[PDB]
């Protein structure tokens, strides 16, 4: 509980469909982007943690909650964009007379800051009398021991929880999904999807002096104007598709039915024909 592991995985293909065919995970509450639409999503840095808690305490792994493990053992930020996976593990983490190999923190001075691991053992002094190596009224060991007995209902049974913390920021993606790739077509307004950034437009070889550490490029607004190809390391400009307004010149329905169309913003080459200002 207090020594939750963290094995950061990077530079690999993540197929989340494997987790569905495993043991029943009836806690897959993705407090984040999406539980289902997750394979077609590139990530930058995914941090996978692990810990074992009771049954009635799994609801405290949500971003923002009170309790004892969400304030002094393992607290998640309010902007946690990830998925928490838990399942009943009352088949190998329980034993006769209760398992005493899982200790949790009970007493602490202040609330645990987001993503902090407090590996320490000091007698919490709650008041005037300072203790040295004993425990009394104001002194006690802050690490209590869980009692995982195979006798109670599912309210206190051991639950193996694994939380996957995603970043999803403007950085070179390293953990994508099992989605395949296609061939790059530049001179055509098509639908592009580079590392999750969807959209449509014409891609052209830009003469922009992109630095080696820079991947994306934005204009005066927060819109991706240029993106570097993740495979061939080529910088391409993202110009929007051919749009514009349409005006109809109508002399009057009572007079006739002939109408003229005025394509605003076109030079008569991207729609008799007459070019105006």
């Amino acid at each position: 509980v207090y020594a939750w592991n963290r094995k950061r995985i990077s530079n690999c293909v993540a197929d989340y469909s494997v987790l569905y065919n495993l043991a029943p995970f009836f806690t897959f509450k993705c407090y984040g982007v999406s539980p289902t639409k997750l394979n077609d999503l590139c990530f930058t840095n995914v941090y996978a943690d692990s810990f074992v808690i009771r049954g009635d305490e799994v609801r405290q792994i949500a971003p923002g909650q009170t309790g004892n493990i969400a304030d002094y053992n393992y607290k998640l930020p309010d902007d946690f964009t990830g998925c928490v996976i838990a399942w009943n593990s009352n088949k190998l983490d329980s034993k006769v007379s209760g398992n005493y190999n899982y200790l949790y923190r009970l007493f602490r001075k202040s609330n645990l800051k987001p993503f902090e691991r407090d590996i320490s053992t000091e007698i919490y002094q709650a008041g005037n009398k300072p203790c040295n190596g004993v425990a009394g009224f104001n002194c006690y060991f802050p690490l209590r021991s869980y009692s995982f007995r195979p006798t109670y209902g599912v309210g206190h049974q051991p639950y193996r929880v694994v939380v996957l913390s995603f970043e999803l920021l403007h950085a070179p993606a390293t953990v994508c999904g099992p989605k395949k790739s296609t061939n790059l077509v530049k001179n055509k307004c098509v639908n592009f999807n580079f590392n999750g950034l969807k959209g449509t437009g014409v891609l052209t070889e830009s003469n922009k002096k992109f630095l080696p550490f820079q991947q994306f490029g934005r204009d005066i607004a927060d819109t991706t104007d240029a993106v570097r190809d993740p495979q061939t390391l080529e910088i391409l400009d993202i110009t929007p598709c051919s749009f514009g307004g349409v005006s109809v010149i109508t002399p009057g329905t009572n007079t006739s039915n002939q109408v003229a169309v005025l394509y605003q913003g076109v030079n008569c080459t991207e729609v008799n024909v007459f070019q105006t200002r």
Partner: antibody, heavy 120, light 108 residues
């Protein structure tokens, strides 16, 4: 498959310490959730649990008998040894060592049994 | 502990049930309960554990359930090779109880 064979002297002097072993073959005791225990079966009576060991050196014993039951593991040679002191002429029974695969499967595979008749 | 009927009779072909009552159930929720079979002269082998499921190698003749606090073993299609002692075992707060015995006598 799992083969749980027992050994040790069946006949001994009263008021001594038994050395009933349990040579297990076909599985590794270091699996999470596994363990080997001991069940007593008096002649013409029901079963009764005596002791149980786990994969993390945890030694669980019966609450009635704790001053004599001392179990130990020898995974180096795959031979679980059970020792009990203060042998009285009431403990004559066929002992069995069964593997506890997990919490849901309570003693799925059993052994064959060794009768220990020691009164006088 | 756990109490079981002493003698249970059953005609060949019918179905009989066993009773694994509470008897001051310190077991708690009575989640896990396993039933064994011990022929005279052999070793007890597991027939059904976690009564909602059954182990591999056992025919569909054996099934079990637990309505509120009593586990029952439903054995359908009785045969001559079924007269053995059955035991229900659960996890108590400090030990592993094995209950009493139940002798099946298939007449006819």
């Amino acid at each position: 498959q799992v083969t749980l064979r027992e050994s040790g002297p069946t006949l001994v002097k009263p008021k001594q310490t038994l050395t009933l072993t349990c040579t297990f073959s076909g599985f590794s005791l270091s699996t999470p959730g596994g363990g080997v225990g001991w069940i007593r079966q008096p002649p013409g009576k029901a079963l009764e649990w005596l002791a149980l060991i786990y994969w993390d050196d945890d030694k669980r014993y019966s609450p009635s008998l704790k001053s004599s039951l001392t179990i130990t593991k020898d995974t180096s040679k795959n031979q679980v040894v059970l020792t009990m002191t203060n042998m009285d002429p009431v403990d004559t029974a066929t002992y069995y060592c069964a593997r506890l695969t997990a919490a849901d499967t309570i003693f799925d595979c059993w052994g064959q049994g060794t009768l220990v008749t020691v009164s006088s | 502990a756990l109490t079981q009927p002493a003698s249970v009779s059953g005609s060949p072909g019918l179905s009989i049930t066993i009773s694994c009552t509470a008897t001051s159930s310190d077991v708690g929720a009575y989640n896990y309960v396993s039933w064994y079979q011990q022929h005279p002269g052999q070793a007890p082998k597991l027939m059904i554990y976690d009564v909602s499921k059954r182990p591999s190698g056992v025919s569909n003749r054996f099934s079990g359930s637990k309505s509120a606090n009593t586990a029952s073993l439903t054995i359908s299609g009785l045969q001559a090779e079924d007269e053995a002692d059955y035991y229900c075992s659960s996890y108590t707060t400090t030990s592993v109880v094995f209950g009493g015995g139940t002798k099946l006598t298939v007449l006819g």
